Amino acid sequence: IIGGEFTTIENQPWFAAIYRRHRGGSVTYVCGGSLISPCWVISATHCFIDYPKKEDYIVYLGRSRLNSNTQGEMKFEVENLILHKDYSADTLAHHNDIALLKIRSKEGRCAQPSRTIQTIALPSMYNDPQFGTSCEITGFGKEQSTDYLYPEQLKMTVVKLISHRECQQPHYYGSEVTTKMLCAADPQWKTDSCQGDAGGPLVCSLQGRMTLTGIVSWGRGCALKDKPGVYTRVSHFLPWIRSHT
Numbered sequence: 001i002i003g004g005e006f007t008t009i010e011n012q013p014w015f016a017a018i019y020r021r022h023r024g025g026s027v028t029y030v031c032g033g034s035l036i037s038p039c040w041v042i043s044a045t046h047c048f049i050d051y052p053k054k055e056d057y058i059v060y061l062g063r064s065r066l067n068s069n070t071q072g073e074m075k076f077e078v079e080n081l082i083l084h085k086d087y088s089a090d091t092l093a094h095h096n097d098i099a100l101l102k103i104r105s106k107e108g109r110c111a112q113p114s115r116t117i118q119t120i121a122l123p124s125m126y127n128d129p130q131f132g133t134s135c136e137i138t139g140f141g142k143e144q145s146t147d148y149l150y151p152e153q154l155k156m157t158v159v160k161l162i163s164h165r166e167c168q169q170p171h172y173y174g175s176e177v178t179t180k181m182l183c184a185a186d187p188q189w190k191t192d193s194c195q196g197d198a199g200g201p202l203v204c205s206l207q208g209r210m211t212l213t214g215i216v217s218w219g220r221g222c223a224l225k226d227k228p229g230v231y232t233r234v235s236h237f238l239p240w241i242r243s244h245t
């Protein structure tokens with residue numbers, strides 16, 4: 001996350017931290033995700049497509065720090081790693097950039113709500129907040145494009161939903177942005193998602209509830225003028241999601 005504020009998991013209790021264990025025993029951070037039901041985390045296919053072996057991934061819930069334990073965190077194995085059959089990468093854009101991770105503890109449990117762990121609602125089919133709506137993003141991603149380290153403490157910020165009209169302009173992303181994506185940026189371009197925030201939530205109030213409106217997917221740089229964050233448009237993927245859950 002560029003700009004915004006350090007937070008704790010209690011402020012984003014659906015946030016999932018996804019790591020990969022390496023042959024040698026090193027475990028490193030992959031991507032964010034979102035708890036959408038007790039057994040299911042949603043994230044971005046591009047996080048996993050290069051190494052789609054469920055056995056080498058760990059999911060934490062209730063975790064506020066990247067490389068140390070949080071009291072109230074819970075560790076899960078990936079019972080099922082479901083990538084989108086129609087994922088593809090352009091020069092910038094990722095298409096159908098959505099993934100499901102079916103979680104289970106070695107004890108065989110799915111998630112239990114607590115002070116640090118809660119599910120996030122899905123939107124209804126094709127239902128999105130109006131353009132100019134303020135939404136929250138969260139992640140362990142870089143605090144500056146040019147950084148080589150990730151922050152140790154979870155961050156969040158607020159961005160505004162941008163019209164496709166505005167996002168499709170040629171000095172923005174022109175062609176690369178489709179109707180299965182949502183753009184969101186700061187009107188002063190001072191705060192954004194960045195590398196390491198992929199798969200993380202874009203959360204909006206919609207039809208009365210905090211809703212998972214988007215999944216952090218891609219962008220040219222981070223907090224660059226006329227280069228918004230691009231998100232997977234969750235509202236378009238409900239039948240895909242229901243088919244697995």
Ligand SMILES: N=C(N)Nc1ccc(C(=O)Oc2ccc3cc(C(=N)N)ccc3c2)cc1
Nearest residue numbers: 047193194195196197198218219221222229
């Ligand atoms: N094996 C993996 N998990 N790889 C991997 C997985 C994910 C990423 C990653 O996080 O890629 C990006 C990079 C830049 C981004 C910029 C913006 C933006 N301006 N809002 C948004 C998202 C971005 C995402 C990188 C690598």
